[PDB]
């Protein structure tokens, strides 16, 4: 009446603290961190297709600014846009800037299709010293500065392009704003100027704005950029009596747009990861991360907590 058998459980010298509904410090034998709080100091070029803007933000790359030539034909899942990007062309603005930028990034590719526009009696291919391309006055290589005659004349323009292709087209066009009233007349005869771009079910009318702005790259004139989307079976009409910055063609729009843009200075490396933050790629299986709300791809969910420990063992009661 003396043998004894005891039933028990393991323990370690020092366990890990976790939280329950009742207690915020329960020591358990093992635990697993669920919040990823470490990132790589680089972006992973695979398996997602990253395209480095380098000196060009995505707007300039679409416009065809000097230095943005490499971005031609580029296709991306994620467009990497650098904080230290610089304007290298004619001073401009975009009324709905973020919207155009969004459309370009989501679209996921820079596939330009050159087209013929037989304008008028006009001088085409106008250039500028604000947009130098290796020593020479130049311009946005996707845009065409129209500016009147040797014989002092730019009549009414009015050209039509009918989209009978199988894809939606993106036309980017602009309107030039002169500085005084000597201006326009010797860039653009008529006064006031004006552009009307329209489709079957749409329109857009812009009156230029003359006034003198600060000098940027040695100019006080500006160009405002716009865009028009032409669905298959629709068309587009360019109506102008002055100040039009004509397009040289159209960008092709993917039917389904799955791409995006990430603005960061982080360099592109050699690693493999499908989750990218503006602080760098994440390499993790954890369900949460506290590194950045700005996260693209296949990522853990962003949360505020720096740590959340999941118990993977029983309570630790050593000795």
């Amino acid at each position: 009446g003396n043998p004894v058998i005891c039933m028990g459980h393991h323990a370690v010298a020092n366990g890990t603290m976790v939280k329950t509904l009742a207690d915020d410090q329960v020591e358990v034998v093992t635990a697993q961190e669920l919040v990823e709080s470490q990132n790589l100091p680089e972006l992973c070029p695979s398996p997602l297709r990253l395209v480095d803007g380098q000196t060009c933000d995505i707007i300039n790359g679409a416009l065809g600014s000097p230095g943005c030539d490499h971005l031609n034909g580029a296709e991306w899942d994620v467009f990497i846009e650098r904080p230290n990007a610089v304007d290298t062309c004619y001073p401009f603005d975009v009324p709905e800037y973020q919207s155009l930028r969004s459309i370009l990034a989501n679209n996921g590719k820079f596939e330009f299709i050159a087209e013929e526009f037989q304008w008028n009696t006009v001088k085409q291919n106008g250039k500028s010293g604000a947009c130098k391309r290796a020593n020479v006055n130049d311009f946005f290589n996707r845009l065409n500065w129209l500016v009147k005659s040797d014989g002092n004349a730019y009549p009414l323009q009015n050209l039509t392009k009918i989209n009978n292709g199988d894809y939606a087209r993106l036309y980017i066009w602009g309107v030039h704003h002169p500085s005084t009233d000597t201006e326009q007349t010797n860039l653009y005869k008529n006064n006031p100027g004006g552009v009307t771009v329209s489709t079957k079910t749409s329109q857009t009318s812009v009156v230029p704005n003359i006034g003198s702005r600060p000098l940027v790259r040695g100019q006080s004139g500006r160009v405002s950029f716009y865009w028009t989307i032409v669905e298959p079976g629709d068309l587009i009409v360019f109506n102008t009596i002055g100040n039009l910055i004509a397009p040289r063609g159209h960008y092709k729009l993917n039917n389904q747009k799955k791409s995006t843009i990430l603005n960061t200075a982080i360099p592109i490396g050699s690693c493999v990861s499908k989750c990218h933050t503006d602080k760098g790629s994440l390499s993790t299986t954890k369900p949460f991360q506290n590194i950045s709300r700005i996260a693209v791809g296949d990522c853990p969910r962003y949360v505020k907590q720096g740590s959340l420990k999941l118990a993977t063992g029983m309570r630790n009661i050593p000795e």
């Binding site: 058998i5 028990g8 323990a11 976790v18 369900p287 029983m314």
Partner: protein
């Protein structure tokens, strides 16, 4: 935990037990010994690793979203964009906080329960040949050599073999 075994009538764990989560410690005429119980251990591990896999499971495959960082304020539209993201983050942070507390509460009850199931299993094996001492241990009222002990641990113990000896030791 709910069953009062771990950190309960079992006063502490065994650092000496390194090849199992639960086990047996015995003392008889020819010595002492500690041995792991695989069934109880595996049952606990299966339920916890089961949690883990349901946890790491989740896509969250997001590409084009909204702007989330701003140089200068613009007003109404920016306010909304910020509010939406802030609202999202709070809700997901709450989800994360509650999930872990729920899982951990449950994991602790599960391991407490598995400890108790092992104890109860052995209790039922022993029938009238032993008495609960109150600390997770049974006093066995008959000679039980190493083979007898092992028969208890591997489920082949036949209480009728020793019942006459045990009954006599218990009540007289």
């Amino acid at each position: 935990g709910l069953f009062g075994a771990i950190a309960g009538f079992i006063e502490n764990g065994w650092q000496g037990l390194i090849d199992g989560w639960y086990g047996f410690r015995h003392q008889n005429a020819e010595g002492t010994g500690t041995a792991a119980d695989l069934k109880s251990t595996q049952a606990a591990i299966d339920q916890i690793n089961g949690k883990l896999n349901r946890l790491i499971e989740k896509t969250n495959d997001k590409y084009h979203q909204i702007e989330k960082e701003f140089e200068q304020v613009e007003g109404r539209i920016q306010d909304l964009e910020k509010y939406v993201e802030d609202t999202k983050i709070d809700l997901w942070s709450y989800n994360a906080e509650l999930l872990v507390a729920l899982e951990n509460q449950h994991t602790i009850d599960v391991t407490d329960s598995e400890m108790n199931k092992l104890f109860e299993r052995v209790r039922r094996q022993l029938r009238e040949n032993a008495e609960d001492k109150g600390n997770g241990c049974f006093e066995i009222f008959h000679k039980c050599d190493n083979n007898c002990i092992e028969s208890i641990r591997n489920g082949t113990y036949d209480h009728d073999i020793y019942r006459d000896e045990a009954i006599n030791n218990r009540f007289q």
